[PDB]
Subunit: 279 residues, 5 copies
């Protein structure tokens, strides 16, 4: 039962308390506290021979205080390596973190959030015997709900990885494929493309049909089919229909609700009509 160097102040009535006075006239009191994550245990200060290891006994996280995380500090006069390790059986260990400890340089791990039942520190001394060594361990637990004050907006920044030239990198372009007809054997309107944010459409017409006619249609507000014009990729022909195949037609579809590529007629085989819409 040893006495320490700090002394508890006494209140007006001579009662001791682990408090500090405050306010102008020192007539109020407050208890200084620290979350247990700010406390450390010294695990060892025994100097190691060259190559010798210190191994903490496995620490069970399960208890009255449920340990969630661990952090370490090592100081030695010669270089070594600190390992933070975990085990579900307190027998076979995996390394969760490892830090090189330079000679005469205090070295800290990060907070390591634990998942297996048992944790330990293992410190392996390098090729020179230590004359001085200390190893400290902090643990934490729990999680507090907080409400962020709404008075001041939070200032945010983006990763160097999310910017370029001091600007946030965005992607505005959307693309989708669509089947108007697949291996059609007879005349029909086929499926209607929903324009939904696209501005541009490329339509390919292809198949075995020996004769076919495709008519290009859009629908606007009334729901009636309206003829539209496309531009053929190979020769820049502009037309509102085609008798050809093995060809592709580009359309400006901004403002339409739907696009229909109707097979007006077909004989002697089948025809597919498919496209890609881009915003």
């Amino acid at each position: 039962m040893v006495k320490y160097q700090y002394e508890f102040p006494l209140d007006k009535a001579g009662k001791a308390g682990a408090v500090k006075p405050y306010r102008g006239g020192k007539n109020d009191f407050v208890t200084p506290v620290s979350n247990l994550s700010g406390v450390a245990e010294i695990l060892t200060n025994a100097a190691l021979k060259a190559t010798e290891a210190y191994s903490q006994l496995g620490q069970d996280r399960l208890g009255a205080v449920l340990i969630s995380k661990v952090k370490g500090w090592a100081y030695a006069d010669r270089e070594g390596t600190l390992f933070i390790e975990e085990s579900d059986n307190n027998n076979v260990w995996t390394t969760t973190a490892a830090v090189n400890v330079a000679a005469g340089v205090l070295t800290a791990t990060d907070w390591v959030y634990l998942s297996k039942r048992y944790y330990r520190f293992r410190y392996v001394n390098g090729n020179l015997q230590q004359s001085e060594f200390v190893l400290y361990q902090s643990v934490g637990a729990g999680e507090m709900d907080v409400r962020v004050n709404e008075k001041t907006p939070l200032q945010i920044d983006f990763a160097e990885n999310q910017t370029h030239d001091g600007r946030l990198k965005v992607e505005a372009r959307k693309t989708f494929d669509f089947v108007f007809h697949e291996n059609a054997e007879s005349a029909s309107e086929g499926a209607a493309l929903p324009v939904d944010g696209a501005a541009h459409l490329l339509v390919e017409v292809y198949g075995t049909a020996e004769m076919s006619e495709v008519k290009f249609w859009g629908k606007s507000v009334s729901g009636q089919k309206l003829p539209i014009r496309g531009v053929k990729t190979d020769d820049a022909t502009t037309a509102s229909s085609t008798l050809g195949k093995a060809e592709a037609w580009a359309f400006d579809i901004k403002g339409f609700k739907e696009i229909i590529m109707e097979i007006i007629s077909i004989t002697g085989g089948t025809l597919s009509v498919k496209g890609t819409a881009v915003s």
Copy 2:
């Protein structure tokens, strides 16, 4: 029963649950933990194959108002841990469930509670356990905090909100507009507010046997100005039409309003409607 820890004494021999600090160890601080960091062991009784442990319903209402719960299970054989809630302490619904592998400490998330009663129920798998522990933590309350403004917070986006390392945005807006619906006689009809659109497609349709639609924009003066549209079927460019069952494309960037005026109509009605796009 006494424990292995010992409270330090101050200079005057007074015990306290404190630690010393500062260079000369002449200051003191009380180590604390929010109650969310504390756990209760609910059971360590090994279960037979398929046997369940069911905690009695825990009332959230009391001097400490329980807001959330978290569990840890460890067993030498596989099982399933359920966190459950009830408003009547009789019929239970499952709020969360976790598979517990053999010999693997398994934790739930924090579960935020809404009904009056909570419990853990653990169902052992097809092999009898030889070792089992189940721990329960609870929390309560909410503290107001003020975030230090010194350094901006670094943020990142869900894998589901990015693509090529770029944030996915949608810049395009579209709206439909009625200039005229089943108009029977000449008039200007309603004026489209351009409001951030750049492009407009106008359909003219109806039973009218004869009609003339004139295309107008308004800029800063408020006076009508003739504008030209492009007909979709043949790329005719004009500032008016005598036709119907047709659609006209306009570049409307810079205009305040667009008007599609029926100059004349006989022998039926006419609708004029469009879609504006940014």
Copy 3:
């Protein structure tokens, strides 16, 4: 009355409201909860149909300065819970109200207080209760915190702010500009700063019987350069006009300023105004 918990004793037999921790259970920590996690039971007296429970006004002013309040109600029949405030402890205004369903634990939000006094008022519905409890939590203060910078925070947007899994953005900017207003004589007028615009629509209008407007841009040197516009009614392209009651569209990408100079005017006045768009 003694309670069911028992404080552990340290090695020297000293009791403390602590828990042991570390492998050898030779360290101690005091479990705590912010007062926001504590509740008081206000009443458990069953109410008749339509009967109200009204808490006496609670003064926020005292050694603990109450900033916020939250409530929980449980009853076997439906009712309504009100959180109310008063500056005189006599006339009350409702700050929050929640419907409480039969047999469903119901919580208010945290209500941040402004007047001097707060209270709960609970009004039972049309059926007499056989079971009722009403709990009240209060909080106070605000702690400064520093958020760890190690991991960027994950952010998410409201369902309200996305569409199709993309953030809704607005990339278009528009502004109006006066080159000339009711000009009576020749001058350059005001110079439009291009500042992010790509497109410009300019209207020329007024009483002037004769006028000439010349279209200019300035680039890096600051010398005036002739530019060409496209008239909306007939797609005439020109670098000046003798006309009015007309509008001219310009591509202004790359220019620093745009000037619409009145070269000459007789017999009235002339306005020249436009809208610039990105």
Copy 4:
């Protein structure tokens, strides 16, 4: 003695704790940061126009005061001032709040910078019959780690949206000098295209004769002729003998743009442009 009573544990030991868990067999100490505590500074009713002035409070001490907040309640109107001083003699006002009759009025948290703080309350034109003034102070700063499990929901200022959409600026512009007062033929400086799609180039100076040739570079690094469009008359060309003119170029896909002076006599020539995304 107050109205609260500490509970006793199983062994009859008192503690400032509450029981919890189903069997009430665990204990927890209720706490509050000192920022949630208040001191009543005064309840003495003031005459019309009379002021209450708190003595200067030194922030420096065992508890290092970082911030202060006030609450005032009076049956007549007045004004509460929060003030600071480095010498406890000359005072500057950091905050001021009007206090209406019969309305509890709070300041914000005021973060302090000078050594001493005080409240000063000035009563209005009517004598008070009832008055209380409360003061809370805070201190310190705790390091926290925000849970990474759940994204935070964020929203934008009314000032940063329009029509429910975030306001963005996608356009970038930069100016560039190809040549400045060139006296003799050379390639001049090469514009790095870097995200621009469009370029406007002005050619101007005293040279009596000059020829500028328009070049782009792509992947190979060899110069390739490009065409521009003159602003005044929409001439399209890959070079010019003229000056006091500007040429517009589509530069999407190029790495660099060069405006080479092929020849010049009888003066100097500048060639400068603006590139836009």
Copy 5:
């Protein structure tokens, strides 16, 4: 023995608590994180140019010190240094603040890394008559969950905003090699369009004769002829017999772009491009 007095509960038990609730029938312990506590290091007035140096403070202990903050007040100007050492012998300065005469001056929180910390204060050219130096330390880190109910209001750096709009970059660019020093006919590599709208293709090399044919692929996977526009003269074609030239393509809607060398004699040919969104 201080001026504050612990209240007594109903049973006359003292406690470091405050009462609360309307009837003052509940109790709470006022607390402060240790970061809110300060130690006075010195109040000894320094002569002109004289320094105060705190003895090195070991961070390692039962409380693991993570950070430190200082406040200085003097009637004459000086400089406060926060310093660190791994050996308690050689010191490096981590932070430094000028302290004006008669102005309370604070450092920021300094997060420590070496084993030992200290304050060193150097007085300026005039002897002090009044001086105090205070030191706060902190430790630990608490896991917190930010309430999901209310969106946070967020703001962007002055550096990321312009005209009240967030600065974004929507344009993406990539280079692509169709052929490099090809010696014989082949299709070469196929460009994946992947979000690009525009493509500039350069054809160059030693080949004395070559033919390149321009192809796109859409949904069927069959090659489709596409037309490009040559930069030097705005020729539009779906193939070329030339080289030392560049061709611009609109590729929106295609899945892949292929630049096929149909034939080549008398040297090699490279075909490379830049695709832009």
